[PDB]
Design an enzyme around this catalytic site. Structure first.
Site, PDB file in Angstrom:
ATOM      1  N   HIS A  45       0.809  -1.202   0.000  1.00 29.78           N
ATOM      2  CA  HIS A  45       0.000   0.000   0.000  1.00 29.78           C
ATOM      3  C   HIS A  45       0.842   1.251   0.000  1.00 29.78           C
ATOM      4  CE1 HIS A  45       0.116   0.302   4.586  1.00 29.78           C
ATOM      5  NE2 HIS A  45       0.122   1.578   4.233  1.00 29.78           N
ATOM      6  N   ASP A  93      -0.183  -7.476   1.697  1.00 28.18           N
ATOM      7  CA  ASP A  93       0.357  -6.114   1.777  1.00 28.18           C
ATOM      8  C   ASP A  93       1.872  -6.155   1.849  1.00 28.18           C
ATOM      9  OD1 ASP A  93      -0.440  -3.116   3.764  1.00 28.18           O
ATOM     10  OD2 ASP A  93       0.515  -3.385   1.783  1.00 28.18           O
ATOM     11  N   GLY A 186       2.839   6.353   8.582  1.00 26.87           N
ATOM     12  CA  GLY A 186       4.231   6.608   8.287  1.00 26.87           C
ATOM     13  C   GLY A 186       5.153   5.504   8.777  1.00 26.87           C
ATOM     14  N   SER A 188       4.099   2.280   8.243  1.00 22.17           N
ATOM     15  CA  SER A 188       3.757   1.213   7.309  1.00 22.17           C
ATOM     16  C   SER A 188       4.950   0.842   6.460  1.00 22.17           C
ATOM     17  CB  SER A 188       2.624   1.616   6.396  1.00 22.17           C
ATOM     18  OG  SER A 188       1.405   1.737   7.115  1.00 22.17           O
ATOM     19  N   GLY A 189       5.061  -0.446   6.166  1.00 24.53           N
ATOM     20  CA  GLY A 189       6.131  -0.931   5.336  1.00 24.53           C
ATOM     21  C   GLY A 189       7.387  -1.294   6.096  1.00 24.53           C
TER      22      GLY A 189
END
Ligand code: NA
Length: 240
Positions: A45, A93, A186, A188-189
């Site tokens: 995402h 994801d 912020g 995420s990932g």
């Protein structure tokens, strides 16, 4: 990260900052994990938008020269083919980013070690989330890399009705949910680092929090379970 502490600058050398071009500058948008000298693992995402992305390795303070950063463009984006941006709860994801250059390794820049395929953490296993995400719900990004201690919440508990119910899948890891500490926008990932047999490994890729807020009791942060995707990761790297 809500409820975090500042990380030491050499604690989490596989953490990267994923940034996009914004006018004459760059803006942090997500975390990631360096997994090869030229590959980063992040959330799908994070790369939905049609932006120009770069990765920063050796980053500590987004807003100051650390003397350790390497800045590299993203050359190729390989999103999991089952990802659907309007259905994050379905999972998948995860994305891999091939970097334009191979970064140089040192105490600030190291490969993240991944768990063996199929590994599932016992409930309440010790982990840290790291990132530059918001430090409060509806707050602002951290300047310096933050960490927070977020124990896992196993599938049976996490998918119970007072937690995430149906929205959490076995392809995900839940961690935290104490109402004080969490991931936030912020983060995420980025990685969830869990201590197993004396060694931290990146068991999660930060995926989502509650629409009601970051640090919400019984809404632990939800991560893509890296150990469900080992073959996918290896296949992408081998074919690119
Ligand atoms: Na910096």
């Amino acid at each position: 990260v809500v409820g975090g502490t500042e990380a030491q600058r050499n604690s989490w050398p596989s953490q990267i900052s994923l940034q996009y071009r914004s006018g004459s500058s760059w803006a942090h948008t997500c975390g990631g994990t360096l997994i090869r000298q030229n590959w980063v693992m992040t959330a799908a995402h994070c790369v939905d938008r049609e932006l120009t992305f770069r990765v920063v390795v050796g980053e500590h303070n987004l807003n100051q020269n650390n003397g350790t950063e390497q800045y590299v463009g993203v050359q190729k984006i390989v999103v999991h083919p089952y990802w659907n941006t309007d259905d994050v709860a379905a999972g998948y994801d995860i994305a891999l980013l091939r970097l334009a250059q191979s970064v140089t390794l040192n105490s600030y820049v190291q490969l993240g070690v991944l768990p063996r395929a199929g590994t599932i953490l016992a409930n309440n296993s010790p982990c840290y989330i790291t990132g530059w995400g918001l430090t409060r719900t509806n707050g602002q990004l951290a300047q310096t890399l933050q960490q927070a201690y977020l124990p896992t919440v196993d599938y049976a508990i996490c998918s119970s009705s007072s937690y995430w119910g149906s929205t959490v899948k076995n392809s995900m890891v839940c961690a935290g949910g104490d109402g004080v500490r969490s991931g936030c926008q912020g983060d995420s990932g980025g990685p969830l680092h869990c201590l197993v047999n004396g060694q931290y490994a990146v068991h999660g890729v930060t995926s989502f929090v509650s629409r009601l807020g970051c640090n919400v009791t019984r809404k632990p942060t939800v991560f893509t379970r890296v150990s469900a995707y080992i073959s996918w990761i290896n296949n992408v790297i081998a074919s690119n």
